[PDB]
Design a protein around this ligand. Structure first.
Ligand SMILES: [Cl-]
Lengths: 218, 208
């Protein structure tokens, strides 16, 4: 089972339960998916079995079609939130990290056309490789963070959270109307443009502001 | 806080994690799969809370299955040995919200995964439950029978269903599987008095 860690690799003591995620949160990503924005945030969830340490080799399933990377800012909740105001949300954030919301894109496309749930495409084992968390105190302005994903030496995604359609705080406030977010829950804030396929053997370099993690698909 | 129990209410030693569920698994109502998180779970014997601004909330009575040993890409034989017990649950669904998501091709989590959306009973051990593919399920609201069905009518039976699920999601010991709902799904409201039956074992509760 996955365990939360700080950037240095130290174990953190928060419980692990779920990851609440937003789709269609960057306009350029909405455009490359051929979709449109939604009136309210598009929400889905990944279970504990999706979570894994991004610093270790990242396993992807081989039989379900192509697996696409979606780099995203991850937010660690340190205090439980239910129907929480924006101010309560702000005070509840423990740290920030970077994840890949790995997606079986072909399946997802079929689910969308059939009006079917996304879990098989978004929730599968290991579909959420994630970094250690950076303290709120050292992270700076969360809504201005840079994210970059380089695969085999080529930049694939490079973006900044300033481009979020629904900003972090109101987003988390919104999510808490539906789901109690326990201490130790993680929130994924969406992916910018550049989403694409990965295959076994690819080398990944991932950066969150000035900080780097490296790994390999395998 | 929700913890797993046996039918009578004693604590079972299994952690609580997630609930893996199937849609459209009975005719009158590749398996459609979705998941509810731990925050969906609550004790069915206690008054049941439903949300007020999300539209109609509908009951779906279903046979619930407690996983007692971990399953990943497991054979039907391994699955059978894995089951620790059986219970009954309501898969509460915000139907109008869901009708919206289906049309737009959005995920179902808001409609299926919301807090308290899995009221569930205690579990009866496998040895004492008899044939789980023959189980009677019954839901009466305010004296009127709303759902009445039997698991023999499952489109995909329990064992193959759980085997299929494990191809996608690892099922930890303590995970619960929901098997689908028979026909008669309908809205519930505050004040509703509920009588639930699993093979004649009766539990009563109420909404609000
Ligand atoms: Cl009894």
């Amino acid at each position: 089972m996955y365990q939360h860690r700080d950037w240095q690799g130290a174990l953190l003591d928060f419980p692990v339960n779920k990851v609440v995620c937003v789709g269609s949160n960057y306009a350029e990503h909405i455009k490359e998916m051929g979709s449109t924005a939604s009136v309210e945030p598009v929400l889905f969830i990944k279970p504990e079995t999706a979570l894994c340490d991004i610093r270790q080799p990242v396993s992807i399933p081989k039989d379900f079609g192509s697996v696409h990377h979606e780099i995203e800012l991850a937010v660690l909740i340190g205090t439980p939130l239910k129907q929480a105001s924006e101010d309560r949300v702000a005070r509840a954030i423990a740290g920030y990290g970077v994840a890949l919301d790995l997606t079986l894109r072909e399946l997802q496309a079929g689910f969308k056309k059939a009006g079917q749930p996304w879990e098989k495409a978004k929730a599968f084992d290991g579909s959420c490789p994630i970094s250690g968390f950076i303290p709120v105190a050292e992270f700076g302005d969360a809504q201005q963070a840079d994210l970059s994903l380089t695969i085999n030496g080529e930049i694939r995604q490079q973006g900044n959270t300033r481009d979020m359609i629904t900003p972090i705080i109101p987003l988390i406030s919104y999510m808490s109307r539906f789901f109690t977010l326990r201490a130790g829950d993680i929130v994924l804030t969406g992916t910018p443009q550049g989403v694409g396929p990965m295959q076994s053997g690819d080398m990944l370099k991932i950066m969150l502001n000035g900080k780097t993690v490296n790994t390999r698909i395998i």
